[PDB]
């Protein structure tokens, strides 16, 4: 009758959590890249491919936080800077009275601080939070440039990958293939605008947890690169102050302006039209506001570039109801929305101009206003098509057999 027969050699699998490598081409726990990655396509295969309950993202975020903190503990702790700071406003040039020349009685030195790193007190003024925050500075050797970092599976784990360019986040896609070493992933911190990343080719792609809910974010990679030509027009000067020598700003070179950005108005308006074409898929008008409030890091497009921390509100853009942005920078910063720890971002001399990409966008319904504020969502776009899988060659099935 219906009797069981074991069938060793089965090609089944059951996805599971695991630790992965940190393979790059150039951040010390890295290993070099594999020579000839093999992408073995699978024919006539389908499986419930999810991307929001993924187990690699939470791994990747844990890695970045560690990689961030590992290369930051040994530095000149800014604890000595906890003392009343004498300061005065700067009127050498105004073309914007934010900067403030601050003098300090020191084991008497002067420096320039932005308004966002000085707090109102009760005249003479003090830094934002040092008596109640263990500030730290960054070594000049390290560079905040985004280095590509691959994730490869260890022995026994086969990383699948979805291929259907029409991929609505979750749900099956019968185009999967074993991609043991993954494609280039760039860990870049950005809000409201995924700078560098992939882009749907056919058309704007809309993916989210569950669209009908207005809590879950909207993650979109639309079609094609829009650039963001944005600069820092200030020849600033760095001059060492030995306390173990934290960097500061002694003065600047002549003219002063604001870090204007350029967005190529025509291209940006063109892209949103395709975007709103898809947004209407699931007649009522769709209007992009520019977020609501809560934190520069979130409210604005707080994007690192050129070794400096930009905080630039998209109020300029996202003003449409159907360029040039005054992008101020802040010296102190608490990355990862943390409580307590905060960095210092030592200054860099001269000017810096940089432009790469606006490949992705983060939107929050009410589609309307943008705000991401959670760098876990950023990496859920690049890892949208990878789920580590453990092969299980055993198998069991009933059969009309009787053994003995």
């Amino acid at each position, epitope marked *: 009758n219906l009797w069981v027969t074991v069938y060793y050699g089965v090609p089944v699998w059951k996805d599971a959590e695991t630790t992965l490598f940190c393979a790059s081409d150039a951040t010390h726990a890295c290993v070099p890249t594999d020579p000839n990655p093999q992408e073995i396509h699978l024919e006539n295969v389908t499986e419930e491919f999810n991307m929001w309950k993924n187990n690699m993202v939470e791994q990747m975020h844990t890695d970045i936080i560690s990689l961030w903190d590992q290369s930051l503990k040994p530095c000149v702790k800014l604890t000595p800077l906890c003392v009343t700071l004498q300061c005065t406003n700067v009127t050498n040039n105004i073309t914007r009275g934010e900067l403030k020349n601050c003098s300090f009685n020191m084991t008497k030195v002067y420096s320039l601080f932005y308004r966002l790193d000085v707090v109102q007190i009760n005249k003479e003024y003090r830094l934002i939070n040092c008596n109640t925050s263990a500030i730290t500075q960054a070594c000049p050797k390290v560079s905040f440039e985004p280095i590509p970092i691959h994730y490869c599976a260890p022995a026994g784990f086969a990383i699948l990958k979805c291929k259907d360019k029409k991929f609505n986040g979750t749900g099956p896609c019968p185009s999967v293939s074993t991609v043991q070493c993954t494609h280039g992933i760039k860990p870049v911190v950005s809000t409201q605008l995924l700078l560098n990343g992939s882009l749907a080719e056919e058309e704007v792609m809309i993916r989210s947890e569950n669209i009908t809910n207005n809590a879950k974010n909207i993650l979109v990679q639309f079609n094609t690169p829009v650039q963001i030509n944005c600069t820092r027009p200030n020849n600033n000067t760095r001059k060492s102050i030995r306390i173990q020598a934290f960097y500061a700003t002694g003065d600047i070179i002549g003219d002063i302006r604001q870090a204007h950005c350029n967005v190529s108005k025509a291209t940006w308006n063109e892209t949103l039209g395709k975007v709103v074409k898809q947004l209407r898929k699931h007649n009522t008008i769709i209007r992009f506001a520019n977020s609501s409030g809560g934190d520069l890091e979130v409210t604005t497009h707080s994007f690192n570039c050129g070794g400096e921390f930009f905080y630039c509100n998209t109020s300029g853009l996202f003003n449409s109801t159907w360029i040039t942005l005054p992008c101020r920078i802040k010296q102190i910063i608490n990355m990862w929305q943390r409580i307590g*720890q905060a960095m210092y971002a030592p200054p860099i001399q001269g000017v810096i101009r940089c432009v790469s990409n606006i490949t992705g966008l983060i939107l929050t319904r009410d589609t309307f206003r943008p705000g991401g504020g959670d760098m876990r969502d950023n990496w859920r776009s690049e890892l949208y098509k990878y789920k580590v899988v453990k092969i299980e060659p055993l198998g069991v099935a009933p059969t009309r057999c009787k053994r003995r």
Partner: T-cell receptor, first 110, second 108 residues
Framework: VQLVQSGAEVKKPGASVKVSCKASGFTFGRYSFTWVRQAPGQGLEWVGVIVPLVGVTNSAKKFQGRVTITADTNTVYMDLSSLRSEDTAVYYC??????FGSGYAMDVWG | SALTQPPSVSGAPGERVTISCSGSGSNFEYSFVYWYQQVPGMAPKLLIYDNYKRPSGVSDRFSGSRSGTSASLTITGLQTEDESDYYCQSYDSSLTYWVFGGGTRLTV
């Protein structure tokens, strides 16, 4: 996981109160703890915050130096000095932020 | 900072109640606002963090909203269970101080 908390007490004006919160099921790791209190029939009013990782403390600044919050490795201790009639309240403690240290929304409550 | 709530807002079951979160300060444009529910006599629980999100084990009926300097907590499908107090707070990241709202009592 839960925040087991000390029992009720009866103190005098200007006496010393020291309440406890023991991390049941988890270590300090990167979380931060805050202390809030509620006058009976009144809304919550903040009291303090500690970050066990880096020893950072704070207060509501209308407890001017009266309150100190300590972390021992397992539990957290906050002490009151110079009590007055307005300081009678239920003193909750809560965990701030998930793993990774992110967030500021205190959600697990004793 | 400081922020003030209406002291009590009431409504019949099945309605769409909106409890305002005023008191907006100059810095309140920054400083995310959360939302807390407490059953009177019980430990307050969390409802909304970072102005719109919702934790896993919280009913989908609640929802968040930010409007200019003010905030609002939106409820649909009101039931008899909603008889409790709702407090809204904001994390002033400058001076590192949570400040709580006065207290709103939702009465059926």
């Amino acid at each position: 996981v839960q925040l087991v908390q000390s029992g009720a007490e009866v103190k005098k004006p200007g006496a010393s109160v020291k309440v406890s919160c023991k991390a049941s099921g988890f270590t300090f790791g990167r979380y931060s703890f805050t202390w809030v209190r509620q006058a009976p029939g009144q809304g919550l009013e903040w009291v303090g915050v500690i970050v066990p990782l880096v020893g950072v403390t704070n207060s509501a600044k209308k407890f001017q130096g009266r309150v100190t919050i300590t972390a021992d490795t397992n539990t957290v201790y906050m002490d009151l000095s110079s009590l007055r009639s307005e300081d009678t309240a239920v003193y909750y403690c809560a965990r701030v932020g998930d793993r990774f240290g992110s967030g500021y929304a205190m959600d697990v409550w004793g | 900072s400081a922020l003030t709530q209406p002291p009590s807002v009431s409504g019949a079951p099945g309605e769409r109640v909106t409890i305002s979160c005023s008191g907006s300060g100059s810095n309140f444009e920054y400083s995310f606002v959360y939302w807390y529910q407490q059953v009177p006599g019980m430990a307050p629980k969390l409802l909304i963090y970072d102005n719109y999100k919702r934790p896993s084990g919280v009913s989908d009926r609640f929802s968040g909203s930010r409007s200019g300097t003010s905030a609002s907590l939106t409820i649909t499908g009101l039931q008899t269970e909603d008889e409790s107090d709702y407090y809204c707070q904001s994390y002033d990241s400058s001076l590192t101080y949570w400040v709580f709202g006065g207290g709103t009592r939702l009465t059926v």
